[PDB]
Amino acid sequence: PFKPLVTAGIESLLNTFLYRSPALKTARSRLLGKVLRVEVKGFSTSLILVFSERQVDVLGEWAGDADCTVIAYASVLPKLRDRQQLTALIRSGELEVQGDIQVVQNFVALADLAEFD
Amino acid sequence: PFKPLVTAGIESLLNTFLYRSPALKTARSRLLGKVLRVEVKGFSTSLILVFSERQVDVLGEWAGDADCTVIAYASVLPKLRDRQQLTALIRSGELEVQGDIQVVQNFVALADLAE
Amino acid sequence: MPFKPLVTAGIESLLNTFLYRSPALKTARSRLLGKVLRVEVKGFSTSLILVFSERQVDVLGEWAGDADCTVIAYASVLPKLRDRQQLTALIRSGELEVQGDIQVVQNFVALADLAEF
Amino acid sequence: PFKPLVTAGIESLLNTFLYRSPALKTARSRLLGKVLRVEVKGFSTSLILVFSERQVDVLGEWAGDADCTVIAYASVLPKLRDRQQLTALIRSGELEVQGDIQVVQNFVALADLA
Ligand SMILES: [Ca+2]
Ligand SMILES: [Ca+2]
Ligand SMILES: [Ca+2]
Ligand SMILES: [Ca+2]
Ligand SMILES: [Ca+2]
Ligand SMILES: [Ca+2]
Ligand SMILES: [Ca+2]
Ligand SMILES: [Ca+2]
Ligand SMILES: [Ca+2]
Ligand SMILES: [Ca+2]
Ligand SMILES: [Ca+2]
Ligand SMILES: [Ca+2]
Ligand SMILES: [Ca+2]
Ligand SMILES: [Ca+2]
Ligand SMILES: [Ca+2]
Ligand SMILES: [Ca+2]
Description:
The structure is a homotetramer. Helices cover 37% and strands 21% of the residues of chain A. The first copy, chain A, is α+β, with helices and mostly antiparallel strands. One calcium ion (CA) binds at residues 82, 112 of chain B.
């Protein structure tokens, strides 16, 4: 399978850009204890992001309850890099939000200020 | 340095009794991604339990939102060993539950299976 | 882009997902507790340092210390370090060079062989 | 039952104080892949500390050979909190060091920074 390689590469990417900088501590702390389930529309699978203080875990399977579920095609997910693009994708129907919309809004705010040094 | 030793001793106790047995897997999985903030009434301090697949983190301070908040004096907290004791503690007023009562019900069911 | 920080993080993610999740791999993992395996990727002329603990494996890009076992091979031969029945042939062929404690790479390959991908 | 609770409580304490701060990264990296066996002299028990990048593992038992072994009574072991403290305990005879003394020196330097 290619899913174990996709979840590991996404985990690597999110942690390198969102969890390395001390400037991103406040944006990361808004996501503390949150689970963001992403339902990939093209493929039959989901990606589950679990947010901690020092890391984000990106899982293929999760027996728990998610605080926010986002349903979209693989192609639209890289566009979730700011609040302006998130409002447009919801409006266009491209992205469906379930649960606490503030989880995905705080994710996109953290992603908007992604940096590595 | 009293509180850091209490949170570490509680974390040690919870993981040794609740996270070691493979028989407790189903009870543990009902607590996955849940946060249980305990407000210790006597000492006016809190203990925050965060539940994962392989462990429970016990923290002195937590900046997030809790799924369930239990308010009681330190003396009543060790009595959360089964569902019969929980129902009595709530009824007597000794224990106060806020949020999702199912988080504390699944905690005492997991604690009942430990010993 | 920082491919090395992303590569070490993606490798760390996979090794932990496949080798550190199953309770069947507990004994194989325990043979590696306290060991450091340095891998020199011949094509890229960069190294990966694996540090083995009880509950996890840490993957570092740089380390100024001395590793218990250093394995030198090209990126393409490294996925072949999954068959315990082949590691002896790998070494004989010259494809993989072992320095230090050969029992570290033998126990890594045996742990990797037990895992299901 | 007592020992699994002691090793787990010590593991919890060491990780909370030594493995949380990014300022302790360099001190932690000197301990990478090292095993420090601690022989508690009062109780007939040992604690084995295994140092990684992101955590310390505290084990009750281990069949391997440790990089360093420290032998002392439970009462003197909380005094291993700085480099001047360790030099005094060795001098006085209160603490016995076996193996690589640099493992315990780097542990006490990491503990001093906390
Ligand atoms: Ca697509
Ligand atoms: Ca939650
Ligand atoms: Ca309080
Ligand atoms: Ca508090
Ligand atoms: Ca809050
Ligand atoms: Ca009380
Ligand atoms: Ca009962
Ligand atoms: Ca019972
Ligand atoms: Ca070693
Ligand atoms: Ca095989
Ligand atoms: Ca196999
Ligand atoms: Ca003894
Ligand atoms: Ca012993
Ligand atoms: Ca442990
Ligand atoms: Ca000093
Ligand atoms: Ca100090």
